[PDB]
């Protein structure tokens with residue numbers, strides 16, 4: 001807190017930034033617990049105040065119910081709120097929320113199968129597609145296609161994509177079968 | 185009407201600060217200045233945490249600033265909330 | 281249209297003074313300045 | 329030999345990629361032509377006959393020619409998609425996985441959620457030698473290495489990324505230099521990275537647009553067995569024309585709210601069914617001849633079916649279809665029942681649906 | 691030309707009442723609601739015609755038995771034995787009907803296809819009668835706004 005105060009009130013002191021580089025790790029550790037607000041001080045100046053924020057308070061603040069209450073509060077203030085009562089309503093909301101987070105902290109004291117089936121279907125069907133190349137038996141085809149003409153060339157070009165589309169159809173059927181087995 | 189109200193809430197929160205009420209452009213003269221101001225300098229969650237800490241702190245252990253804010257919260261005066269001013273605006277010359 | 285007209289009336293009265301016509305921000309450079317101006321300095325009831 | 333076959337393959341791929349969109353227009357035009365020819369179809373004699381009756385007589389061969397052409401164009405549209413838009417999908421996927429690997433450690437520090445099929449399937453491509461095949465950055469493996477090589481161990485990072493350790497130093501040292509021509513079948517077989525092609529095929533199969541095109545081709549094929557299967561291709565206008573997108577976006581903008589409104593209507597109708605079944609079972613006779621009574625609300629499921637179908641489709645409510653209550657001890661209660669049904673179901677809920685559509689437009 | 695033809699047939703003078711849209715600027719504001727989104731209004735009708743054609747395909751393939759429209763049993767008048775006739779029926783009677791095609795075709799009670807036909811009728815009513823007409827009305831209202 002002392003170092004943050006000094007840094008923010010002396011923004012261009014090279015000796016101070018080198019010292020902060022020395023103090024880097026501690027500041028990183030204490031960043032979540034360090035609070036920072038600005039108030040209209042007694043000396044008719046805006047004064048910045050540093051305090052401590054507790055981990056329990058932060059967690060209870062980040063609980064989803066408190067977030068929903070915050071959204072409702074902001075909606076109400078923006079839509080049907082005046083400028084006089086804005087800070088009064090904000091303080092009332094803060095008090096109610098503080099009470100509810102304290103009570104929550106008090107009380108709080110001490111799918112996959114379908115994804116797996118789809119992945120297995122992908123692996124199996126793609127493997128069955130790739131066995132055709134993995135046999136390394138393309139020699140028999142190469143015997144006849146040594147006399148490679150444009151017609152046979154285009155025929156093989158189409159046949160590859162036709163095989164891919166057959167594999168996709170088989171994969172979709174396998175997915176449906178697995179999903180039915182899972183739901184049953 | 186409900187959709188327009190939601191849009192109005194979004195626009196207000198994205199264009200002006202909740203506490204001081206200054207527009208986004210003034211802070212945006214410095215890059216990311218508006219979000220820096222609304223998330224570190226004038227965060228409403230920080231004010232809530234400060235009220236929590238000040239209530240849960242012993243009155244005898246209060247500092248001068250804490251005692252000022254405590255007395256004034258007890259008397260329900262909200263002048264201590266910065267309205268129309270901020271650290272940057274006060275120290276424009278020195279900070280920049 | 282009726283709802284939009286009501287909203288326009290509200291926005292105009294909340295953003296600029298009835299008499300002089302200056303915006304709210306200029307008065308709001310001083311806290312509560314706009315309502316001070318529109319309720320003590322330039323109040324239309326006071327002119328009436 | 330290979331220098332010619334690869335060149336001609338590339339020419340064909342380029343042609344299909346260039347003409348992908350024109351073929352997608354031609355498929356729609358042929359689909360409209362086939363469906364217009366099918367509109368002059370009649371059944372004859374039960375005996376169901378696939379007989380096209382027309383005065384000209386030539387539309388019958390024209391239908392077969394058009395069906396064959398449609399199937400060919402549908403196949404060509406899959407080929408063109410593969411040549412044109414698959415590379416962009418692979419590029420984006422490889423970019424995303426690389427960024428998650430480097431700036432998030434998606435497989436070094438953290439692990440996939442075991443419920444993300446994309447994340448689980450992407451584990452295959454990390455070990456591949458042909459990684460960023462499409463993505464420009466070829467130093468992602470050396471970047472992850474430099475980022476996490478000390479904390480998580482160089483030998484473990486290298487194993488995760490498929491980086492081979494000793495080969496680099498053993499080649500930088502005294503190393504034999506003799507290349508071997510790829511013209512051999514063994515060489516061209518060894519060149520292919522099986523695992524990377526596996527992962528790429530999986531990504532393509534999981535792609536939505538490729539699945540839609542496969543469905544298109546499947547329906548085109550089934551159209552030969554039954555010609556009326558070609559009518560499903562008229563559902564492609566929503567994607568073919570950008571003008572229909574604006575109209576359909578009104579419906580799709582608030583689809584969740586539209587479904588919830590129907591669910592709420594089904595609940596309100598169920599409550600009305602409960603009330604009618606408990607108190608007004610006498611007015612639900614739907615038989616004109618008195619000898620056989622046909623009661624529609626003696627059963628809960630039948631009464632709910634009646635209310636959901638006839639009562640909802642009726643313009644005045646369930647009172648338009650059930651018996652008149654005049655001169656009965658429950659006349660007032662039944663009148664309230666009918667009026668409330670008409671007001672809440674017929675008037676308000678349908679107004680909610682229409683308001684949702686109008687608000688989507690606005 | 692229409693004024694001249696009015697002498698041969700006096701009822702040709704009724705076409706000149708179509709001139710009010712241009713004569714009065716007040717009607718321009720009302721008509722601009724329709725003309726502002728005319729392309730969308732035509733496309734909506736085209737989409738309705740396609741959806742009705744799909745429903746006609748389904749009815750022709752599976753529900754040809756419920757489309758008898760003759761009261762006397764001696765002469766059956768089937769409206770869906772022909773594709774064009776069935777489409778005409780669906781486009782005219784079914785669309786103009788307030789409850790859908792189920793208001794005009796035979797009751798499906800006690801049939802093996804009862805559930806499928808009920809789904810058919812409900813979906814027709816929801817998509818055609820309720821949604822598409824709502825799209826047209828929303829287009830007009832949005833043009834006003």
Ligand SMILES: Nc1ncnc2c1ncn2[C@@H]1O[C@H](COP(=O)(O)OP(=O)(O)OP(=O)(O)O)[C@@H](O)[C@H]1O
Pocket residue numbers: 067074197198199200201202203219222223226227228229
């Ligand atoms: N004093 C303020 N404190 C916090 N946010 C402010 C303040 N003034 C304005 N804002 C605006 O509020 C935005 C944050 O929105 P908000 O706090 O309502 O939550 P959110 O972004 O909707 O989501 P979440 O619930 O996850 O925090 C900031 O980006 C900023 O533009």
Ligand SMILES: Nc1ncnc2c1ncn2[C@@H]1O[C@H](COP(=O)(O)OP(=O)(O)OP(=O)(O)O)[C@@H](O)[C@H]1O
Pocket residue numbers: 293294295296297298299315318319322323324325
């Ligand atoms: N010259 C002005 N005189 C008074 N109010 C003004 C003037 N210029 C602007 N205003 C605005 O009018 C607001 C007061 O609203 P208004 O006088 O219409 O009544 P109200 O708040 O709706 O209620 P009430 O009828 O109880 O007075 C002020 O808050 C201010 O923003």
Ligand SMILES: [Zn+2]
Pocket residue numbers: 201202203204205206221222226270
């Ligand atoms: Zn602020």
Ligand SMILES: [Zn+2]
Pocket residue numbers: 297298299300301302317318322
């Ligand atoms: Zn004034």
